[PDB]
């Protein structure tokens, strides 16, 4: 997809993530588990809901064919009537099929964008307090218990709180 | 020793529903919405409780002039729409023509 | 019914239908298409 996340650097989706479209899986001394990102999920639902409504609203006034009859010496106007009615039905068939293919392309890229932005939201909070593994996961250089994990998921991660613990660990590793 | 981890990921399920885009066809997705009605009941019905006038083997001309084969329609109650066959057999029994017939049928379309 | 066509009546809340162009009542909009499906969810890979 355009944003490189879904079936991209994140190899596949999670059957285990049932309560959000995008979210997290963590593992620490306390255990492991899934959690939805409810904010990005809700934003995306709102966008798709509006999209569906927009598409239907804009098609709300389109052409309505009406039966009209003509006698055997009104063939020219009969033919003009047929072409006119068919002409609008072709315009509107095109408008609907095309709009649906275009918006479908945009919806699937919108999801990819949302996953990418969630990953970056975590990446830019953690900075060098964790290692990027390249597969959508981060390995922390400090212990990160459940309240700490929740601070990452809710955008309140406190980098200064853990920066010295992480520095010591980064140095241990880099010193070999 | 391996550290704690957090991973970012996204919903997957067992859906086999597919949609099309401009660059791709038959893309499998978690969820989709059909927006096209393809079914009907094959019958002619009352419209919001009001029965249509169904002329059977009679034409509009046969009804209004009173072709005696059209006696079902000697008096007809209020209708919602009228149904006429493509080529009704009971029309002008004594042959001839009905002047401005299509214009009359147009008027009937608002009565 | 609330929507009648010469082939049969329609009972539906879909925005579109492909039954017949000449309808009366409160109907969906007619198109010639055989399929219109909007994506809502994500790409779902094996």
């Amino acid at each position: 997809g355009l944003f490189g996340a879904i079936a991209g650097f994140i190899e596949g989706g999670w059957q285990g993530m049932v309560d959000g479209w995008y979210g997290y899986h963590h593992s620490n001394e306390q255990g492991s588990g899934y959690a939805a990102d409810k904010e990005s999920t809700q934003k995306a639902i709102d966008g798709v809901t509006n999209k569906v409504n927009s598409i239907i609203d804009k098609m709300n006034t389109q052409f309505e064919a009406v039966g009209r009859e003509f006698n055997n010496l009104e063939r020219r106007i009969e033919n003009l009537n047929k072409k006119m009615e068919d002409g609008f039905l072709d315009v509107w068939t095109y408008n609907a099929e095309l709009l649906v293919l275009m918006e479908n392309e945009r919806t699937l890229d919108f999801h990819d964008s949302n996953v990418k932005n969630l990953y970056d939201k975590v990446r830019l909070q953690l900075r060098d307090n964790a290692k990027e593994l390249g597969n959508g996961c981060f390995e922390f250089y400090h212990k990160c218990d459940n309240e700490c994990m929740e601070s990452v998921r809710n955008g309140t991660y406190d980098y200064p709180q853990y920066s010295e613990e992480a520095r010591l660990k980064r140095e241990e590793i880099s010193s070999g | 020793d391996p550290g704690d981890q957090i991973c970012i990921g996204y919903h997957a399920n067992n859906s086999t529903e597919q949609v099309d885009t401009i660059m791709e066809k038959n893309v499998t997705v978690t969820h989709a919405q059909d927006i096209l009605e393809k079914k009907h009941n094959g019958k002619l019905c009352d419209l919001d409780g009001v029965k249509p006038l169904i002329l059977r083997d009679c034409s509009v001309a046969g009804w209004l002039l009173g072709n005696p084969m059209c006696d079902e329609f000697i008096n007809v109650p209020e209708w919602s729409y009228i149904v006429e066959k493509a080529n009704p057999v009971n029309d002008l029994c004594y042959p001839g023509d009905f002047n401005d017939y299509e214009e009359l049928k147009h008027l009937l379309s608002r009565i | 019914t609330k929507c009648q066509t010469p082939m049969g009546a329609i009972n539906s809340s879909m925005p579109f239908h492909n039954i017949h162009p000449l309808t009366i009542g409160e109907c969906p909009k007619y198109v010639k298409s055989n399929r219109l499906v909007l994506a809502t969810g994500l790409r779902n890979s094996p």
Partner: antibody, heavy 121, light 110 residues
């Protein structure tokens, strides 16, 4: 300001099925979860399940799994609950209620007026 | 059940009254509590959500709290219009479903 308006009272015989509707008026509820919650006479609230139709989720209480079908029509902004194999144990008022967001954890803040179902031979 | 409440509480106009809610680790323990108020024959109203949060339309005399696997609704300054049934509620991760307490009937004395 959205209101949820439910269908009218139902009188049903044993073994039959009832399908109650919940229309969101004054605005859509398609971007939220709506639950169905029933209250038997003199008893407490009891969750039946819910649906969040754009998100794509339908959930059911284990105790009603298999006997209840919850569904939605996003185009008419309506949610439905169909309960099958009715007995007098199902005589209750059934409410639809909308959650504060797309899923079932959040407080239910908008409620329908309720629909009485009375099951009797 | 799953959540357990006293069937009845009472107070006088202006008194402080509290209503308890006992749960388990699979609900109150690990999930947020919502409270609902219901007058007879009418639908419930959301009073508190996320343990202690109050909708803007709900008077500030209503407050909630959660500790351990227990929760409490407090009504400071009881008013006559508060006579109603009160329900606590939470998601339960073992049942994978929403649960409710059995309800408490509040009587305003006097």
């Amino acid at each position: 300001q959205v209101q949820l308006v439910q269908s009218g009272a139902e009188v049903k015989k044993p073994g039959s099925s009832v399908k109650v509707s919940c229309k969101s008026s004054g605005g859509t509820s398609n971007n939220y979860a709506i639950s169905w919650v029933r209250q038997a006479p003199g008893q407490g609230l009891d969750w039946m399940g819910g649906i969040s139709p754009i998100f794509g989720s339908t959930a059911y209480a284990q105790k009603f799994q298999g006997r209840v079908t919850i569904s939605a029509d996003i185009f008419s902004n309506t949610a439905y609950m169909e309960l099958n194999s009715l007995t007098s144990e199902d005589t209750a008022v059934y409410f639809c209620a909308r959650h504060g967001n797309y899923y079932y954890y959040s407080g239910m803040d908008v409620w329908g007026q309720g629909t009485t179902v009375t099951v009797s031979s | 059940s799953a959540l357990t409440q006293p069937p009845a509480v009472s107070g006088t106009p202006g008194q402080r009254v509290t209503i308890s809610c006992s749960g388990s680790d699979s609900n109150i323990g690990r999930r947020s509590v919502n409270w609902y108020q219901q007058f007879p024959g009418t639908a419930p109203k959301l009073l508190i959500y996320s343990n202690d949060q109050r909708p803007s339309v709900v008077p500030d005399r209503f407050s909630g709290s959660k500790s351990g696997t227990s929760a409490s609704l407090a009504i400071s300054g009881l008013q006559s219009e508060d006579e109603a049934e009160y329900y606590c509620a939470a998601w339960d991760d073992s049942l994978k479903g929403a649960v409710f307490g059995g309800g408490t009937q509040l009587t305003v004395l006097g």
